[PDB]
Paper text:
The structure of SMURF1 is typical of a NEDD4 subfamily member, with a N-terminal C2 domain for cellular membrane localization, WW domains for target recognition, and a catalytic HECT domain that binds E2 and mediates target ubiquitylation through a surface-protruding catalytic cysteine. At the cellular level, SMURF1 acts as a negative regulator of bone morphogenetic protein (BMP) signaling, which modulates cell migration, proliferation, and apoptosis. Ubiquitin transfer requires a motion facilitated by a flexible hinge that connects the HECT domain N- and C-lobes. To gain structural insights into the mechanism of selective inhibition, we crystallized the HECT domains of both SMURF1 and SMURF2, without and with a representative SMURF1 inhibitor, compound-8 (Cpd-8), and determined structures at 2.05–2.75 Å resolution.
In the absence of the inhibitor, the HECT domains of SMURF1 and SMURF2 adopted a highly similar architecture, comprising N- and C-lobes connected by a flexible glycine-containing hinge (residues G634–D639). Across all 28 HECT domain structures (including SMURF1), the α helix10 (αH10) comprises two and a half turns and ends with the conserved glycine, which provides flexibility between the N- and C-lobes through its high tolerance of ϕ/Ψ dihedral angles. To determine amino acid sequences critical for SMURF1 activity, we employed a fast Fourier transformation-based multiple alignment. These analyses demonstrated that G634, which stems the SMURF1 hinge, is invariant in all HECT sequences across animal, plant, and fungal kingdoms and in all 28 HECT domain structures. Function of the hinge is facilitated by its length and the flexibility provided by amino acid residues with a tolerance to a wide range of ϕ/Ψ dihedral angles. (A) In unbound-SMURF1, I631 of the αH10 (and other nearby residues) occupies the cryptic cavity, which is therefore not available for small molecule inhibitor binding.
Numbering used by the authors: 377 to 438, 442 to 750
Write the structure that this text describes.
Amino acid sequence: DLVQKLKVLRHELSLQQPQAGHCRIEVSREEIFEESYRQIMKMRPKDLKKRLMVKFRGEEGLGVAREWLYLLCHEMLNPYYGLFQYSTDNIYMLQINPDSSINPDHLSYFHFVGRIMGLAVFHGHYINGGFTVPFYKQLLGKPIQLSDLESVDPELHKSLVWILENDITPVLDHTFCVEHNAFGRILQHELKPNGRNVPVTEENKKEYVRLYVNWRFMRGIEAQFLALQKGFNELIPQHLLKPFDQKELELIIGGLDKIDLNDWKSNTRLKHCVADSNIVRWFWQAVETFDEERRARLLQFVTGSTRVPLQGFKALQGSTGAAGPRLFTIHLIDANTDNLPKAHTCFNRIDIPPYESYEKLYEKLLTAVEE
């Protein structure tokens, strides 16, 4: 199982975390994207491996990287910024935008997104944002298969399938060079060192084919991916990803994308109330009533993030923030019943007033989650 292989990866990463010092990030909520960019990019990789201390500017009086990561991923992964775009054929998943060159500094922003992804995995946190299958395969360092290219370029796929099941000796005159229309002009690109003078033979056509497929998936997003990858590997070394596949990397990076209710209830603690308190009974009744989306907004309202750890609700306050696992807490406060439930994201605690009815609790709970 994944938690087993992950604990080996987390232990190797934990050895790289200097027990002395804190990685200090203080950004505003209204400028979280550009302020986090400036602060993270000013640091050296060694500085990012120190235990995280994220504070929102001003809000430190009356801090969590869980909420900061959530709000930061929400911003950087939005197509408004031109780094990522939704896929045409996977309208539910992000991919690198090939027209990212519009921003001349795009390569530094991709390197920053990579730093944020590595920082999240390194500190036991997750990234809210789903990527495509070739994104995870590329990030992992493993080669894309020829069958994955049929959907992307069926004419090139047809040609490369011909090469593999035919004797190219009396027919082909290819080199490890691909000539393509680069917007307005044809450009020769070598697939390997000195590819223009390396002919494709029966002895090396398998290598030529896998390099051509790899090159075609990187078309337009080469500089972008390289930048992201260098930021990600500054926290998560490439060798430590070796025991994982595309689906396992997607889970390591983003956590579970389904909230189990029984695990949420098993890892819930109560302050100022007991299991048979009306507020507790009513809260869980309102929670079964909520849809998968309303449940995720409730998790974000209380814990600061929509992300569920791969170990479940038991490991809620990630690897760093204060001491350890600060479990989801229901706190019955004595306060005016016209108030909305308060949330202390730093403790995964919801302060619920002593409502007089289930419907009263429901409407105030729903109203708090939409805000």
